[PDB]
Ligand binder design. Structure first.
Ligand SMILES: Nc1ncnc2c1ncn2[C@@H]1O[C@H](COP(=O)(O)OP(=O)(O)OP(=O)(O)O)[C@@H](O)[C@H]1O
Ligand SMILES: Nc1ncnc2c1ncn2[C@@H]1O[C@H](COP(=O)(O)OP(=O)(O)OP(=O)(O)O)[C@@H](O)[C@H]1O
Ligand SMILES: [Ca+2]
Ligand SMILES: [Ca+2]
Lengths: 164, 162
């Protein structure tokens, strides 16, 4: 059931506290700039922004390498800007159901929970994504760590992207 | 906080992920599609506007707090008639309304109020409570909670419906 897709979620770390610190005027400007940054970088990796959730985005890619490259570029850009906003990123792949400009299904929820596990500045991918990129020449992962994900049974191993 | 005054209602399904996993994607998509139509219908009856979806819930704008609360009351009633339990939180304040979206700290606050609600419950912030027996709505005495990202405590009031 559903078409196979790679889902990337972004979320800003402690965005509510940031918004409260800087005030709504500054926040709207910051989030507009951030939206444009994410949108541009997604487009470069032939991805599609499915939707935004205030301080985060759900993004779809056809290939896992595109999702990871996008995450890598986004973290790089955020580091460059910081000269502050930290973003966590999670990537998962599997079948999901399209409805309008949205995605539904357990693999959407799982991608979101993978992102929720990541620290600010970090890109985490699920084991299927790591395995699919086991033979990549430029993408490197740590040895992963075991977590449990809300709503799911059992344990999942999540892998951090190690960028050049 | 900047922008125009708006009433923001959030819904959220309790343990939707576990529910998805138990019944499967086929059944879940059918269920959430049905749920979406129900929420959209009830929102429109109280002159609200769905701003967006957040997977298993919605962000809704109303001009007046009585509209948002009546919507929540009808939604909870409807869900009982129909298992999915929904949390509902309502806040009001100034927000920036740009490109068919709402931005600002009062958006985040409304989300946090909804996250504090029990499944089956409608929680409102103090400003909503204060703005409303003249219009047929009753509340408990409130509970004081901390909300992630905000300093100090906030008194949240449950709607007591017939
Ligand atoms: N434009 C928007 N659309 C939808 N939701 C929004 C919007 N703006 C704010 N929100 C809400 O505000 C909240 C953003 O805060 P979030 O829950 O990510 O915690 P945070 O303060 O970033 O802390 P952390 O993510 O580090 O736990 C979300 O729950 C989201 O629903
Ligand atoms: N179609 C979708 N679009 C966007 N996000 C989705 C979608 N489906 C699932 N999600 C994500 O999965 C999340 C479910 O998270 P939530 O934190 O609400 O968990 P839950 O399983 O409902 O448990 P509880 O709400 O009781 O904590 C959604 O809020 C959203 O972040
Ligand atoms: Ca966040
Ligand atoms: Ca939920």
């Amino acid at each position: 059931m559903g078409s196979r897709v790679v889902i990337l979620f972004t979320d800003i770390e402690e965005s509510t506290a940031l918004n409260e610190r800087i005030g709504d005027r500054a926040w709207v400007k910051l989030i507009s700039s951030h939206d444009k940054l994410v949108s541009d970088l997604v487009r470069r990796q032939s991805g599609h922004v499915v939707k935004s959730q205030g301080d985060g985005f759900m993004v779809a890619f056809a290939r896992p390498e595109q999702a990871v490259r996008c995450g890598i570029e986004l973290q790089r850009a955020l580091r460059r800007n910081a000269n502050e906003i930290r973003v966590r990123i999670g990537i998962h792949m599997g079948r999901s159901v399209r409805r309008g400009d949205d995605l539904f299904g357990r693999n959407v929820a799982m991608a979101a929970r993978v992102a929720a596990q990541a620290a600010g500045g970090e890109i985490l991918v699920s084991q299927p994504v790591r395995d699919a990129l086991s033979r990549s020449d430029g993408i490197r992962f740590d040895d992963g760590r075991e977590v449990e994900l809300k709503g799911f049974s059992g344990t999942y191993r999540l892998f951090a992207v190690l960028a050049s």
